[PDB]
Each structure stands twice: as C-alpha cells, then as structure tokens.
Amino acid sequence: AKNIKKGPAPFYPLEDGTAGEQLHKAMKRYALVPGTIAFTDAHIEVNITYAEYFEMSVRLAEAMKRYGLNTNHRIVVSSENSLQFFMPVLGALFIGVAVAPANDCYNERELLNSMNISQPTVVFVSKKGLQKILNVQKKLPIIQKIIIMDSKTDYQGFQSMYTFVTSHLPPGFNEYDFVPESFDRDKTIALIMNSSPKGVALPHRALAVRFSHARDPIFGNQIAPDTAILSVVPFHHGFGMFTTLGYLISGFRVVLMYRFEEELFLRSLQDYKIQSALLVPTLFSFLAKSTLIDKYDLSNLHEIASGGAPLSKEVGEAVAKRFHLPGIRQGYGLTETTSAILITPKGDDKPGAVGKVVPFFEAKVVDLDTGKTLGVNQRGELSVRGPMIMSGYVNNPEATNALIDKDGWLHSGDIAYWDEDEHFFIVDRLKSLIKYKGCQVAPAELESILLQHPNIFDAGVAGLPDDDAGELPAAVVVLEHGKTMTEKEIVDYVASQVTTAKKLRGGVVFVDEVPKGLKLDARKIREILIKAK
Template sequence: MKEDNDFVISGPTPYEPLCEDTLGQVFGKIFMENAPDHKIMVNAHNGKVLTTQKLVDDSCQLAQALRVHGCSPQTTICIGSENNLEFFIPIFASIFSGTIMVPLNVNYTDQELKHTLNITKPKIAFCSKRVTQRYLKLKKEMSFLETIIVIDTDDVIEGTISMNEFVRSKMNGRTVTPHNFLPFDGDSMDSVAFVLCSSGTTGLPKGVMLTHQNIVTRLLQSRYPAYLSNHDVVLGLMPFFHSYGLFFALTSIFNRHLTVMMDRFEEDFFLKSIQDYKVSVVRLAPPLAIFLAKNPKVNKYDLSCVAEVFCAGAPLSGKTEVQLKKRLNLKAIFQAYGCTEGTLALTIMNKDVYRPGSCGKVITYMQCKVRDPETGRSLGPYEIGELCFKGPTVMKGYYMNPQATKESFTSDGWLRTGDLGYYDDEQFFYIVDRLKELIKYNGYQVAPAELEAILVHHPKVFEAGVIGLPDEVAGELPIAFVVLKEGQKISEKELQAYVANKVSSQKKLRGGIIFVPSIPKNPSGKILRKELKKKLHEYKKVLQSKL
C-alpha cells in the first residue's frame, strides 16, 4: 500500500524545546523548587494531606531501597491499588530508580490479572490492603513475583511486607535525601518508564511501553499556555491505574496544582467535595459530564468554584457540552482525544476557543494525518479516515509483542489509532467512529471477542456476536446476538448473569441479549459486525422497551 503525506496537520509551535532529561531528573528539579510544605494531594474522604516533603522523602528512600534490593532499569514492578495518598510513592520511586512500572486495574478478574502479570512478569507487586489477598493467591502460581509490598498499612499480613518495613530492612538506618539522591539518568528516548495495559481486539490486554521522553513531553504539553489552567485545585476522581488518571495526576504535580483525591464516585459526596474543597478544575469522562449537566442534585450544591471542565475518554455530544457550560457558568470546557499508545492527549481544545462537539486541534509537538485505511492516501478537510499520529508522545511499542507493534504503525511510521474522524477548514477535529472493533464503555475498552468466547462456552449457546449499542451516558453498551443450540432454552437474564460472573464490571452485557437464528459471517468465518449493527435497527422497538 502506497502511503502519502500530502495532508499533514501539525500542532502549534512548542512553547519550550523538548527535554532530554529523564522523568526522575525532571521531577527532581520540580520538587527542589517547591516549598516542603506545599500540598500536592488531599484525600477528600478523610482530609489527610500529602506534601512535597512527604512524597519526595519517601519516594527517594524507596527508590534507593529498590536499588539495594537488586532492581535495575530492566526490572518490572507493578502496583495494584485504588486511589489513595500512598499510590504515588511507589510510582515516583520507580521513576527515580529507573525501573519499569506497571499500574494494574484493581477491578480485573483473577483471570485478567493473571494474564497481565504473565505479560509483564513483575518482580515486585505494590498493592493496597484491599487487594492484598488476590496478589498473595496469584503469587503462589507465579515464580517471577518475588515480593508483595503493602503500601497503606504497617499491619503484619502474612506473606507480605509493609512499604515502611521494606525500606527499613534495605536501608539499615541509612537515609538519602533529594539533595544527595541521584535519579535514573539513562537514555530518555529509549528507556521505558511505564507499561500500561491496553485491550486488543482479541480480548487479551497488551502492554503499551511509554518511555521517559514520552511522558516528559506530555508534561511539557500541559504547560503550553493555551492548555495550562489558571486554576489550581483539581479533581482527582479518575483511577490512578488508568492512563487518564495517572497522567493528569502527574501533570498536576508538575504544575503545582492541588489534587482533591477520591477513590469512588458517590453522587452527593462527589458534589459536596467539589463544593467544600472549592475544586476549580474538574476532569472526568462523559458519563459524569452528563451527570453534571442534567442531574437535579447539582442544584443543591454551590459549584460556582468550578471554572473549567476537562472531558475525555469518549466523545461528548455538543448538546451536552453546551448544557454543562451554561449550567455551571464555566469559563472553559475542554474536550480532548487521545489513547494510551499516544501518552493520552493527541488533540485538545484551546481554552480560549469554544467549538461544541469538537475534540480540538492537534496538540503541540505532534503531527496528524487522516488516512484512508484502504488506500493509505492522506485525506483533506471533511474527509473521514483513520487518525494517525507522529511525534514524541507516540509509544515505543507493545511489551514483548513485536508483531502487534508492527501492525500498529503504517509502513512509514505513523501510529494507527483505529479511530475514524475528520477535521474542518480550521483544523478542528471530530471523532466519528472506530475502525477497531473495540467497544468503549465509560472510557474503558471492551473486546467483543472476549465476551463471545465466554458466551460460546455456555453449554446452551451455539455461537455469539457482540457489538456496542450506542448510549448517551456510557458511550456504548456491550450487546450480544446469540444463537442457541437446537432444542435449548435460556433467558436473557440468566445468560447476562453467567457473563457477569466471569468479567469485570465494564464488560457486563448491559445492552442486553438478542436471540437470533444465525450470526452473519464472511467466507473465512469472521463475524460481520457491521451486519450486526444493521440488525440493531430491526430490534429497535424491542431494545427501547428494555432500556
């Protein structure tokens, strides 16, 4: 296939040149500039505070302990935890020591967690006490997992060691400080800082390798004047193990903003926390944007402190965006588009421009072309194609998966996002659909093939096809077309419950199940999902009666 670059859209001229320092060196300088008592994060549930002094002292000590333990820049370690104040101590210890950190979804089933651990083979698992027993169980099956360190308690849990005790046992009374500790100083372009999990169309997660330069560039992007917030109290509700929550927390620390942290969403607590802590910047996914735009409970609280809303993870309708901006009297509302493979944001709305429904323009340092997936030809304004990107935030590749890495790039080196969209005459971008078959539920990727494999293992099911049912709140709901074996009967609720017991919450068949006589397939046996989407129209009245 012949590729061309006749239509390439570049982001604005960078505000500052790219930095060759590692992530640890960059943050080391930031922390030295901050006052020791500067508040970095507050736990909205109990009011406890994390300061610069606490974070930098504990993470430097832990980084040195990891080095004494034998961890090198080739060592993978992981963290499994809900949002808490201790989460970023192992994160920064890994950044400073140069190890490869793998944040893991605490909502993974045992099967999903086991698969991800087998991909990355971490030597050490940091975890919260809430999930410790799961890691202890898996450790028995995985010889590579040597040590489990509990981050949020000093209580003795058999088979584990607390984070404080681990440091004490390795340091033997010695101390390091930000003034005498030397952060990892390797090749920032080549050295991997994080491996983040991203679902594939096969249903098996892949590990996205992000380098120190990828993330340093993301930090520099956040300081570009057109994107940088003038408000400094930020909501930290998005999960820190997810790229969205992780990178926005890092950029908040980088820009000296205070993050008001929550570990779960509860309507009244969410609204009261914004009110009481005077949160000025709210970062969320479309379902919560819709909640703020439409839910009557919002009127019970004083949210006049909110100046900006940042929405990403899935497209937000222009209509909802207008409602939200008007209801909260916002100074700015940002939509952005991105992916884990691009270190999150790839296009973003300028805070001084309002264009409802658009995910903005190409972000600084980056280039984009809209590519015809059939011919490889780059496309002009208003022509729909696959969004492809080049630049310093594009991933190094998939961990231990060269074939998947090769398939994710064009022959001339552009990252293929699998998302279909277009740009207008002013180079504002709009997302239309996904070339990939992934379902996007509440910002999470759900692989149809995984759900299909579970369904066909039911003794009464002959075959199944899964697609996304469009939904205003969640983006898409997984819905299944099912062919039963001859003479068999089972209810929709029974089959939904069967799947729900085997998957994470986001993968449940919330869209329902439609029983059909056959599943459309091509001659090679591949399910024709486009045909299934057409069938949705035939069952529209049935679906509306259920939802």
C-alpha cells in the same frame, strides 16, 4: 502536506533529562514550599504534603536501588485509587525501574497474564489485592517481594512501604541529597501499561513530551502551582496516570474522588476551591441536570475537562453554560499514545470537537477501504504519529507492526474528520471495543463464552449506547439450528462466567447472521443492536 494536521511548536518547552529527573527536580522544589499539598482524599479529609510525598518517594527509590533494582527490572503497582498510589511510581521513575500498573479490577487470570508480560521483580499492592497477588506469585517465580501500600506497619508478615524503606536505607539518610538516576530516556522504559491484553512500553521520552503538554498554557494548564484540581480518573489507566503525573510536576493539589457522590462532587468543589475538574463523560448528565448545583461559591472553577470516551456535544455545552464555562475541555488518546494527542486548545472551544493535534504530533484521516489520505470534512480512520507513541508491544512485534506502520503512523481504530479550522471530531469506532463506565470490555472474550453454549451457533458482541454508562455490552445471537434460548437465560449464563464489568447489560438480539467480511463488523452489529432499542 495540507492534508496532514500538525501540532504547533510547544507553548511550554520540552525539558532535558529523564521523566524521573524532571519529576524529582520539580517536586523537590514544591517540597520546600511550606503547606503545599500534593494529594487530598476528598472522602476522609486527609492530605499529604509535597514535602511528605517527595520524601517518601525518595526513600522508596533509594531503598529499591539498595534492594538491587535497576533499569533491567520492573515493578507492579496494583491498587485502587489512593493517596499512596504514586509513591512507588515516582520512586521507580527516579531510578529508571519500569512501572507496570495493574488494574485493581482484574481477576487472577488477567492479572497473571498482565504480569506474565511485565515480569516484575517486586510488587506493590493494597490490602484488597493481596490475596490475588499471592495466588499469582506462586505461578510467577520472578516475583521476589510483595510490599503492602495502605498499611503503616507490617501486614500479614509482609513489609509495608514504610518498614520496607527503614530496612533498606542507611541510617542518617538525607532525602534532599538524593540524586535521581540519569539514563538514555529514549530506550529506558517508564511504564508498561495494559492494553486490552498486552503490555504497552512507554519510554521516558514520551513522559517528557507529556510533561510539556501538561504545563502548556494552551494544551494543558498554566503553571501556577497554587492550583487545585479534582480528579475522578483511575490511576492504573493512561487517562489517570498521565494527567496526574502532569499535575504533580505542575505542583498542583490533586483532590481525589473514588466514588461519585452527587452531594460530594459539588461540596468538594466549593470547600477545596476547585479551579479545574478532570471528569469522565458519564457524570455530565448528572452535572447537567441536578438542582443542588446552584448554591456554592464556584467562581474559582474556570475549567472542566473530559476524555477517554465520547462526550455528547449537546450535553457538553449544557454543562458548560450552567457553570459559565467557555465549553468543556477535552482530550482524546489511546494507551499506545501515552496520553491525549488531540486536545481542545485553551481559547479555541468548538462544541463537539475533541480538539486539535498537540505539539510534536501529526494526525491524518485515511479512507476506510482504499487507505488513501483524505481531505477536509471527510470521514475516515484516524492515524497519529509523534514521540508519545509507545516503543511497541512488549515481546509482541507482530501486534506492534500491525498497529504502527513503517513510518510511525498508528492507526487508531476510530473514525473521524477534521474541519477547516483543524478541529477534529470523533464520530464512530471501527474497532471492536466497548467502554462500560470507563472500563474496557473486549468483545472476543464474550463471543467465545457465547459460542461455548450448545444452543449458540454464532454471536457478535458490541456496544449499546447508554446515557449513563456510555456503552452496555450486548450481543447479536444466532441460535443453533432448532435449539431454543431466551435473552434472560443467555444473560445469566454469561454473568456466571464473567467479572462485573463484562456483564451483558445491554441484552441480546437474535439474528440469522453475524455481520462479517473477510472479520466481524462492529458498526453493523452496533446498528442491529440499536435498531431494536
């Protein structure tokens, strides 16, 4: 058992009851403390108090409960990051209705298939996303109601969140006497997240564990709710969803930035007195280089975190020195593990490490071809188990069991080693998966589009390392015998077929063979790609 790394016992205890109960219990409290702000849009200088947030989420839960929704139902929240985003999430959580967040970047096909899985009864959506929701509802009969999020009044004949609640609540309804539902938090699903595409069922139990990590003085943030954090992370993904839920149960003021502005990301830090910034590894070179950074009162900024993708050790400690931080704080996780399950422990900074095993979890490194558990400083595939690991892929047990073994070990597709202090380091990726500016890009979609081309015999798609995007989608192309085609042509061809995140920005390299085994070798493909550039 010396080769199994285990989290310590939690520094903030696990709390009783559903995640809805825990959220409600905590926000009801913040809601009684005058002037406590829950969310701030940094762009337009608009705040929503905890009081207001709590009241609207409660109005929403009762309305939904009266509309007929129970633990047998799901909803979708399809919306770009906004002040209103969490209202239906919290609302549904209070009553045990599963929330299925949809990526606001999704096209109609991806969206249709996401919701084909989640089977939601009601859909919450912004103005931007309504027309897509409509085109889907036609093909998806189970959707019976579409409610607009970023409108106060009704819109194109559809109820807003506000008119929807006034119409389903009994008059003289009191929010502060609402009691959230109790249910078996192990079997009641809190969220169904997309995993590129499948539905990741996350029970309430997993959220309860996250709420422990979140308020943990070592593995999250110490609970002084007089705290302001700035977050630039998409709400619809696990990184943004479970950090933010943890910030709310902590009573933090969550300051939001949707677009990174060099002039703003520093101004917002100074004016709002940001104590902690939750960032993605792409903004780090910016924050390492910019000279404007020098003149603001940031004495209140004691922490900067990153996650979701690799952070350069060197860049990380540069940004850490400039801000007089002990180091960049980090978290590593997958959608299937709910949230981060490796996290840099406060006071235990070690540059380049993504952190240590969180409480309740275990981690191990298994050899790439024998599957044997390995020891200290040995590169292998990282496997994890613990109570935030998803219940399983919604209506896909075969993909569930290939990912999660008989003993609960989830093999992550990442390559890692742990050192003597039990610090973990992520040094490579086994699986085929690209992250372009945080956005997931499945190589298989790109490959099938490439093969479609008459001049293309075979192709392999992987990530090309980019300093400001992390990875650029790029391809090894094997031309059909005696057929010709340039890189520019292959690129515009693919562009015509794909949404903006999947554009083959990394270019193309021509080869005689796409590296395979007995399945595509992502590492060998990334190798050939860089060998060029």
